[PDB]
Design a protein around this ligand. Structure first.
Ligand SMILES: CC(=O)N[C@@H]1[C@@H](O[C@@H]2O[C@H](CO)[C@H](O)[C@H](O)[C@H]2O)[C@H](O)[C@@H](CO)O[C@H]1O
Length: 138
């Protein structure tokens, strides 16, 4: 299917009620997954499942400004499974990114980058087979 790393343009940037849907399958022996919502060189929203950090599964979320990472937000609830198909939904809300995986709410990420309309691309990378990446307005 699609090539990874994958760049998904977000024409005119993100806006509340925008829903991004990523369909994929985690590769066997996977180490990492990363979604990077980018504003130019900045990463507005970095969503990074890690399969083996000190023999732990953990989701790391953060923001990258002027090539510096900020305070990490961590979610120990880990809905991904090596070898298995997943669905990540990212709903843009006025004050947060809302993330659900396989139809179950996972986490919220408060907006640190405030110029939502300038977050105009989503990079998709890591140890997955990518089936599809799309968006729609709800
Ligand atoms: C640059 C670096 O290695 N920083 C370490 C963190 O790893 C980075 O974390 C950011 C998100 O915060 C990105 O995921 C980047 O790809 C990672 O290299 C690491 O999470 C923390 C905690 O162990 O230590 C930093 O030094």
């Amino acid at each position: 299917p699609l090539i990874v790393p994958y760049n998904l343009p977000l024409p005119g940037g993100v806006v509340p009620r925008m829903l991004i849907t990523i369909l994929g399958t985690v590769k066997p022996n996977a180490n990492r997954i990363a979604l990077d919502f980018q504003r130019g060189n900045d990463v507005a929203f970095h969503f990074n499942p890690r399969f083996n950090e000190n023999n732990r599964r953990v989701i790391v979320c953060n923001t990258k400004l002027d090539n510096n990472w900020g305070r990490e937000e961590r979610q120990s609830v880990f809905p991904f499974e090596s070898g298995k198909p997943f669905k990540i939904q990212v709903l843009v809300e006025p004050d947060h990114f809302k993330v659900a995986v396989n139809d179950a709410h996972l986490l919220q990420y408060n907006h640190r980058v405030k110029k939502l309309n300038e977050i105009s691309k989503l990079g998709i990378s890591g140890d997955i087979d990518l089936t599809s990446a799309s968006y729609t307005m709800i």
